[PDB]
Design an enzyme around this catalytic site. Structure first.
Site, short mmCIF file in Angstrom:
data_model
loop_
_atom_site.label_atom_id
_atom_site.label_comp_id
_atom_site.label_asym_id
_atom_site.label_seq_id
_atom_site.Cartn_x
_atom_site.Cartn_y
_atom_site.Cartn_z
CG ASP A 1 40.07 64.35 47.70
OD1 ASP A 1 39.90 65.57 47.99
OD2 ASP A 1 40.14 63.42 48.56
CG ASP B 1 41.22 66.88 54.92
OD1 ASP B 1 40.24 67.39 54.31
OD2 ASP B 1 41.63 65.71 54.74
C1 LIG Z 1 39.89 68.64 49.92
C2 LIG Z 1 40.90 67.81 50.69
O1 LIG Z 1 41.70 68.30 51.49
N1 LIG Z 1 40.90 66.50 50.45
C3 LIG Z 1 41.68 65.55 51.23
C4 LIG Z 1 40.72 64.55 51.88
N2 LIG Z 1 41.41 63.71 52.87
C5 LIG Z 1 42.59 63.08 52.28
C6 LIG Z 1 43.37 62.36 53.40
O2 LIG Z 1 42.47 61.55 54.18
C7 LIG Z 1 43.53 63.98 51.49
O3 LIG Z 1 44.21 64.88 52.37
C8 LIG Z 1 42.72 64.78 50.47
O4 LIG Z 1 43.58 65.63 49.70
#
Ligand SMILES: CC(=O)N[C@H]1CN[C@H](CO)[C@H](O)[C@@H]1O
Ligand SMILES: *[C@@H]1O[C@H](CO)[C@@H](O[C@@H]2O[C@H](CO)[C@@H](O[C@@H]3O[C@H](CO[C@H]4O[C@H](CO)[C@@H](O)[C@H](O)[C@@H]4O)[C@@H](O)[C@H](O[C@H]4O[C@H](CO)[C@@H](O)[C@H](O)[C@@H]4O)[C@@H]3O)[C@H](O)[C@H]2NC(C)=O)[C@H](O)[C@H]1NC(C)=O
Ligand SMILES: *[C@@H]1O[C@H](CO)[C@@H](O[C@@H]2O[C@H](CO)[C@@H](O[C@@H]3O[C@H](CO[C@H]4O[C@H](CO)[C@@H](O)[C@H](O)[C@@H]4O)[C@@H](O)[C@H](O[C@H]4O[C@H](CO)[C@@H](O)[C@H](O)[C@@H]4O)[C@@H]3O)[C@H](O)[C@H]2NC(C)=O)[C@H](O)[C@H]1NC(C)=O
Ligand SMILES: *[C@@H]1O[C@H](CO)[C@@H](O[C@@H]2O[C@H](CO)[C@@H](O[C@@H]3O[C@H](CO)[C@@H](O)[C@H](O)[C@@H]3O)[C@H](O)[C@H]2NC(C)=O)[C@H](O)[C@H]1NC(C)=O
Ligand SMILES: *[C@@H]1O[C@H](CO[C@@H]2O[C@@H](C)[C@@H](O)[C@@H](O)[C@@H]2O)[C@@H](O[C@@H]2O[C@H](CO)[C@@H](O)[C@H](O)[C@H]2NC(C)=O)[C@H](O)[C@H]1NC(C)=O
Ligand SMILES: *[C@@H]1O[C@H](CO)[C@@H](O)[C@H](O)[C@H]1NC(C)=O
Ligand SMILES: *[C@@H]1O[C@H](CO)[C@@H](O)[C@H](O)[C@H]1NC(C)=O
Ligand SMILES: CC(=O)N[C@H]1CN[C@H](CO)[C@H](O)[C@@H]1O
Lengths: 387, 400
Positions: free
Chosen positions: A200, A139
């Site tokens: 998301d 992330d």
């Molecule tokens: C683009 C991305 O990775 N978004 C993520 C943003 N953060 C959350 C957890 O806090 C999830 O992993 C979600 O899929």
């Protein structure tokens, strides 16, 4: 990413959409992010046909981390992961599954857990490899663009240097708008096995449509970059949860399949309905998703009737067609022919309806056919030449 | 409208949302707009519990009209309604149901069928009464604002003059923006039994949300106008169709009930699932919708957690509460108390969960409670002072 992994899109289960950052194990022991949750889901995947159908990854998302020890080594929350991550990796491996984990390129995870800063990238990669993780989702909260530009390549290199094959899922482009000039897809393909391009997913049809729309608006850029070992990722499947109707659930499965998307579920496998299992375990659907050519599909037609047609090219001269109704009234009788959908002339085709299993044989380009498409729903064909 | 009708909101079935303007009986005989469709739906309403639970109207919408005869009298399409409308009304009446029909105050119906122009208002009213129709929906396409201002009262007067009670559903405000000063709700209440305030519902959750948002935004204006014989109409129920999930289906039923809305289904009753029938046939749900005070509810609380609370006042100091999650993640544990929801005095309450049937006893204003609400879903309570139970058993009677 040239690490031999994910020559077809990853299939599995990911905690986040359904279970989020629930850490209240005192009040909600059955649904909190914990060792128990992951073991129970692993058991369902082993016992209820999921693994056998291709669903092999069981992925931890945010909210697993407890802190760092005196040497700076990442640790899980000891109350929720009492036996530690190697225990869970070993358990999942004993059931023929693979374990994914989660980190953040930045000071903190999105939910405020310890981050993998630039100075921790190598240590964290080494820790994950030591634990025998099989996949990492990185992330990108709480970082600068320059930090992400250094960090994502640094992590790919660090994972490689461990000698353990670890599939690498990169959230980088989602934090930078998903598009050129700020996102360089040839670079992403070289350093990542898959990347989250966009926002998301949430448990709503509006969310599915928002994602589909952005993917189709930009398909001239996105379609060519996908292939074996390097996929676009429009996010988790919602099938089994609260927000999608039956037609919508079937639509998401079909559309993610024609897009050569990961099939990463995120739902309570302990209570999933028979109807929803039947969607997710559809053998022909999975065969199409997993097609060895790895060619992402495109929207080929959009009609004023609000019927859209998507096409994905497949192995052995075959194709997938998805007829998608964005109507909100009633079933629609869509009249077409393979010639109107740009198919090769003089060839005779046979089609199998992926959801009904029914066979339509002897289709020439000029042959008129009708499909009945329900609102916010699809009809999907697997089409191939015959003699 | 003071015609003795719809002292509670109308309940029934309306063809439009699900079956629309499908007139291709040659290719689609089972689903086209035709006498067969209406007869089969009437049979299902009579046989499968609908009528017995209060669903009494069976309403024709647009696309029924064949033309006007040499004297200007409306005729149904002879190929699709071969026995005529009186036959259909008789059939529907024989099953203890009521027949609704459709016309348009303008040059044509929205789908281009013959319009009920000002010159035809009286003749068409007289025709409908002669056919023994029980309800009229008067659409507003292909008209001007002045034609509507003349025509809606003209039709109310014309129906009255036939001597037959005909429930009158007026689309007028939907064609005027739904709000004062263009819409005069005091007039509407005097000339109509119900009115479509806002945009047509479509088979999607976004649609339901858009309609709810509009009604909530304007509830200070809209809530007070509803009452026995004169209802706001947020449009048809989508339950049984394609666009709503189970949680959404239960949410629409609950919220329409709290709004004192008509419960006009529009779905294939021949293939409706047991699960969806269970929502629409829920006896406590229907009792609440049909409460004799006819007081429309309101949104009373919106929280940053995206949980909203609606409340509808009911007979005998009872209330309906709907806890509604606009979250899109996972089930949410909503912690509250009746005191936090503006219940005051030291009354002790009991609640029945409308969908689970579970009883929660001993709620005081200060009592902390938790309800678990799923995303795009509701929890609904029927709440009453516990002393209501005892008092309801202590009434005393005598012969006259
Ligand atoms: C683009 C991305 O990775 N978004 C993520 C943003 N953060 C959350 C957890 O806090 C999830 O992993 C979600 O899929
Ligand atoms: C760390 O990072 C390194 C470098 O990126 C990775 O090493 C690469 O690993 C991949 C996957 O195993 C190797 O790719 C495979 O090469 C096979 C043989 O190629 C030889 O010849 C080429 C030149 O033609 C040389 O460059 C090379 O040194 C080899 O001697 C191919 O047969 C494989 O083909 C596969 O794909 C094709 C089509 O895509 C299919 O038709 C086949 O069926 C087959 O699936 C494949 O291309 C690559 O050669 C490695 N590079 C180097 C420099 O070693 C490590 O895997 C990685 N380690 C970890 C732990 O992540
Ligand atoms: C054309 O338009 C006229 C209005 O201009 C309509 O006439 C009204 O019709 C309604 C419905 O029939 C009448 O309402 C009924 O009145 C009954 C008698 O009440 C009279 O006596 C009291 C004194 O006690 C007066 O205050 C009152 O003004 C009346 O003169 C009531 O007994 C009826 O009660 C009903 O509702 C209660 C619940 O509230 C039930 O318990 C009862 O069982 C019952 O159903 C009812 O209120 C009204 O009186 C008429 N108004 C006028 C001015 O005449 C026509 O109906 C309409 N015609 C058509 C075909 O649409
Ligand atoms: C990630 O973390 C680093 C390190 O903690 C962050 O840098 C630090 O940020 C703090 C404030 O957030 C800085 O304090 C500031 O110092 C100046 C000195 O003149 C003062 O004027 C300000 O009022 C403030 O107190 C601190 O110096 C800094 N430390 C280091 C070692 O860099 C960084 O901001 C975080 N990055 C992201 C992307 O969130
Ligand atoms: C409703 O119809 C009137 C009459 O329209 C005429 O007859 C129709 C069957 C059709 O053939 C029309 O094309 C005819 O014009 C409309 O009033 C007329 O409006 C036109 C301008 O378009 C004007 O030339 C005439 O003077 C008008 N005729 C009369 C008798 O007043 C009216 O505008 C229509 N209303 C709506 C909302 O569309
Ligand atoms: C297909 O349909 C078109 C238009 O409906 C018609 O003109 C044509 O004859 C049909 N083609 C064949 C090969 O039957
Ligand atoms: C209700 O809960 C709050 C904590 O959220 C607590 O402070 C309060 O005392 C409780 N009230 C009662 C009556 O139990
Ligand atoms: C506000 C209004 O009456 N809208 C209507 C608009 N016209 C169609 C039929 O053509 C339906 O009756 C729909 O309910």
């Amino acid at each position: 990413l040239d690490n031999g992994l994910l020559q077809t899109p990853p299939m599995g289960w990911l905690a986040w959409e359904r279970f989020r950052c629930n850490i209240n194990c005192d009040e909600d022991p059955k649904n909190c992010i914990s060792e128990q949750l992951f073991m129970e889901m692993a058991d369902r995947m082993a016992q209820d046909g999921w693994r056998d159908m291709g669903y092999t990854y069981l992925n931890i998302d945010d909210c697993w981390i407890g802190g760092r020890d005196a040497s700076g080594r990442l640790m899980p929350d000891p109350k929720r992961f009492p036996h530690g991550i190697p225990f869970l990796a070993d358990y999942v491996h004993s059931l023929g599954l693979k374990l994914g984990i989660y980190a953040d390129m930045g000071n903190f995870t999105c939910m405020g857990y310890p981050g993998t800063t630039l100075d921790k990238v190598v240590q964290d990669a080494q820790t994950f490899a030591e634990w025998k993780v099989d996949m990492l989702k990185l992330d990108g909260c709480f970082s600068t663009p320059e930090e992400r530009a250094q960090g994502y390549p640094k992590m790919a290199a660090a994972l490689n240097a461990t000698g353990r094959p670890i599939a690498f899922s990169c959230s980088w482009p989602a934090y930078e708008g998903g598009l050129p000039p700020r996102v360089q897809y040839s670079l992403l393909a070289d350093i990542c096995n898959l990347w989250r391009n966009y926002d998301d997913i949430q448990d709503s049809w509006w969310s599915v449509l928002s994602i589909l729309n952005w993917f189709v608006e930009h398909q001239d850029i996105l379609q060519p970059v996908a292939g074996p070992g390097h996929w676009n990722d429009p996010d988790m499947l919602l099938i089994g949860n609260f927000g999608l109707s039956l037609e919508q659930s079937r639509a998401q499965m079909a559309l993610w399949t024609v897009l050569a998307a990961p099939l990463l579920m995120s739902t309570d496998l302990r209570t999933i309905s028979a109807q929803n299992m039947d969607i997710l375990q559809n053998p022909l659907m999975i065969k199409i998703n997993q097609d060895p050519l790895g060619i992402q599909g495109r929207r080929i037609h959009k009609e004023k009737s609000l019927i859209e047609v998507y096409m994905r090219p497949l192995s052995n001269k075959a194709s997938a067609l998805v007829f998608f109704s964005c109507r909100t009234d009633m079933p629609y009788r869509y009249h077409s022919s393979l010639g109107q959908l740009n198919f090769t002339g003089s060839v005779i085709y046979e089609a199998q309806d992926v959801y009904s299993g029914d066979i339509i044989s002897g289709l020439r380009d000029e042959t008129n056919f009708t499909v009945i498409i329900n609102p916010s729903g699809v009809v999907m064909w697997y089409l191939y030449p015959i003699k």
